[PDB]
Chains A and B, each alone.
Chain A
Amino acid sequence: XXXXXXXXXXXXXXXXXXXXXXXXXXXXXXXXXXXXXXXXXXXXXXXXXXXXXXXXXXXXXXXXXXXXXXXXXXXXXXXXXXXXXXXXXXXXXXXXXXXXXXXXXXXXXXXXXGXGXXXXXXXXXXXXXXXXXXXXXXXXXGXXXXXXXXXXXXXXXXXXXXXXXXXXXXXXXXXXXXXXXXXXXXXXXXXXXXXXXXXXXXXXXXXXXXXXXXXXXXXXXXXXXXXXXXXXXXXXXXXXXXXXXXXXXXXXXXXXXXXXXXXXXXXXXXXXXXXXXXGXXXXXXXXXXXXXXXXXXXXXXXXXXXXXXXXXXXXXXXXXXXXXXXXXXXXXXXXXXXXXXXXXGXXXXXXXXXXXXXXXXXXXXXXXXXXXXXXXXXXXXXXXXXXXXXXXXXXXXXXXXXXXXXXXXXXXXXXXXXXXXXXXXXXX
Chain B
Amino acid sequence: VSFVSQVLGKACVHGRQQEILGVLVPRLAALTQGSYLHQRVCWRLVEQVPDRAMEAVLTGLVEAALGPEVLSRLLGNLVVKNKKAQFVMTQKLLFLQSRLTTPMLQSLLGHLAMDSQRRPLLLQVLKELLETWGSSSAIRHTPLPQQRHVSKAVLICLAQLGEPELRDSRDELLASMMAGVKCRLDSSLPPVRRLGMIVAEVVSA
Chain A residues within 8 Å of B, Cβ to Cβ: 161-167, 169, 204, 242-243, 245-246, 249-250, 282, 285
Q: Is the CB of A166 within 8 A of B136?
A: yes
Chain A residues near B91: list those with CB within 8 A.
242
Q: Is the CB of A166 within 8 A of B141?
A: yes
CB distance from B13 to the nearest CB of A (A): 11
Choose one: B49, B92, B136, B137; the contact of A285 (CB below 8 Å).
B49
Q: How far is the CA of A204 from the CA of B48 in the complex (A)?
A: 20
- Within 8 Å of chain A (Cβ to Cβ): is B201? no
Q: How far is the CA of A246 from the CA of B49 in the complex (A)?
A: 6
Chain A residues near B49: list those with CB within 8 A.
245-246, 249-250, 282, 285
Q: Is the CB of B52 within 8 A of A246?
A: yes
- Within 8 Å of chain A (Cβ to Cβ): is B155? no
Q: Is the CB of A163 within 8 A of B52?
A: no
Q: Is the CB of A162 within 8 A of B134?
A: yes
Chain A residues near B135: list those with CB within 8 A.
162
Chain B residues near A165: list those with CB within 8 A.
137
Nearest B residue to A123, CB-CB: B136
Choose one: A161, A163, A250, A285; the contact of B53 (CB below 8 Å).
A250
Q: Is the CB of A169 within 8 A of B137?
A: yes
A-B contacts, 15 of them at CB < 8 A, read A161-B131, A162-B131, A162-B135, A162-B138, A163-B137, A166-B138, A167-B137, A169-B137, A169-B141, A204-B95, A243-B92, A246-B49, A246-B52, A246-B53, A250-B53
- Within 8 Å of chain A (Cβ to Cβ): is B14? no
Chain A residues near B140: list those with CB within 8 A.
166
CB-based closest 6 A-B pairs:
A166-B137, A163-B137, A162-B137, A162-B138, A246-B49, A162-B134
Instruction: Identify which of B95, B134, B135, B137 gathers the most chain A CB atoms within 10 Å of its CB.
Output: B137
Q: How far is the CA of A164 from the CA of B131 in the complex (A)?
A: 13
Q: Is the CB of A161 within 8 A of B134?
A: yes
Chain B residues near A246: list those with CB within 8 A.
49, 52-53
Q: How far is the CA of A249 from the CA of B51 in the complex (A)?
A: 13
Q: How far is the CA of A204 from the CA of B131 in the complex (A)?
A: 13
For chain B, residues 98 to 132, give those with C-beta under 8 angstroms from any C-beta of chain A: 131
Q: How far is the CA of A351 from the CA of B48 in the complex (A)?
A: 26
For chain B, residues 30 to 81, give those with C-beta under 8 angstroms from any C-beta of chain A: 48-49, 52-53
CB distance from B135 to the nearest CB of A (A): 7
Chain A residues near B137: list those with CB within 8 A.
162-167, 169
CB distance from A291 to the nearest CB of B (A): 16
Q: Apart from A162-B135, A204-B95, what are 6 other A-B pairs with CB-CB below 8 Å?
A: A161-B134, A163-B136, A166-B141, A245-B49, A250-B53, A285-B49
Nearest B residue to A253, CB-CB: B50
Chain B residues near A243: list those with CB within 8 A.
92
Q: How far is the CA of A204 from the CA of B135 in the complex (A)?
A: 16
Q: How many residues of B contact A (CB 8 A)?
A: 15
Q: How far is the CA of A413 from the CA of B165 in the complex (A)?
A: 74
Chain B residues near A164: list those with CB within 8 A.
137
Q: How far is the CA of A204 from the CA of B141 in the complex (A)?
A: 15
Q: How far is the CA of A162 from the CA of B134 in the complex (A)?
A: 7
Chain A residues near B138: list those with CB within 8 A.
162, 166
Chain A residues near B136: list those with CB within 8 A.
162-163, 166
Nearest B residue to A245, CB-CB: B49
CB distance from B9 to the nearest CB of A (A): 11
Q: How far is the CA of A204 from the CA of B132 in the complex (A)?
A: 12
CB distance from B44 to the nearest CB of A (A): 16
CB distance from B45 to the nearest CB of A (A): 16
Nearest B residue to A122, CB-CB: B136
Instruction: Identify which of A162, A242, A243 gathers the most chain B CB atoms within 10 Å of its CB.
Output: A162
Chain A residues near B131: list those with CB within 8 A.
161-162
Nearest A residue to B92, CB-CB: A243
Nearest A residue to B49, CB-CB: A246
Instruction: Identify which of B49, B135, B141 gathers the most chain A CB atoms within 10 Å of its CB.
Output: B49
Chain A residues near B95: list those with CB within 8 A.
204
Nearest B residue to A244, CB-CB: B88
Q: How far is the CA of A169 from the CA of B136 in the complex (A)?
A: 13
CB distance from B130 to the nearest CB of A (A): 11
Chain A residues near B141: list those with CB within 8 A.
166, 169
Nearest B residue to A164, CB-CB: B137
Q: How far is the CA of A169 from the CA of B141 in the complex (A)?
A: 9
Q: How far is the CA of A204 from the CA of B1 in the complex (A)?
A: 31
Nearest A residue to B138, CB-CB: A162
Q: How far is the CA of A282 from the CA of B49 in the complex (A)?
A: 8
Chain B residues near A166: list those with CB within 8 A.
136-138, 140-141
CB distance from A182 to the nearest CB of B (A): 24
Chain B residues near A167: list those with CB within 8 A.
137
Q: How far is the CA of A74 from the CA of B198 in the complex (A)?
A: 30
CB distance from B158 to the nearest CB of A (A): 23
Chain B residues near A161: list those with CB within 8 A.
131, 134
CB distance from A271 to the nearest CB of B (A): 21
Instruction: Identify which of B52, B131, B138 gathers the most chain A CB atoms within 10 Å of its CB.
Output: B138
Nearest A residue to B96, CB-CB: A208
Q: How far is the CA of A204 from the CA of B49 in the complex (A)?
A: 17
Q: How far is the CA of A246 from the CA of B140 in the complex (A)?
A: 28
Chain B residues near A282: list those with CB within 8 A.
49
Instruction: Identify which of B91, B136, B141 gathers the most chain A CB atoms within 10 Å of its CB.
Output: B136
Instruction: Identify which of A166, A243, A249, A250 gathers the most chain B CB atoms within 10 Å of its CB.
Output: A166
Chain A residues near B92: list those with CB within 8 A.
243
Q: How far is the CA of A166 from the CA of B137 in the complex (A)?
A: 5
Chain B residues near A169: list those with CB within 8 A.
137, 141
Nearest B residue to A281, CB-CB: B49
Q: How far is the CA of A250 from the CA of B141 in the complex (A)?
A: 23
Q: How far is the CA of A167 from the CA of B137 in the complex (A)?
A: 8
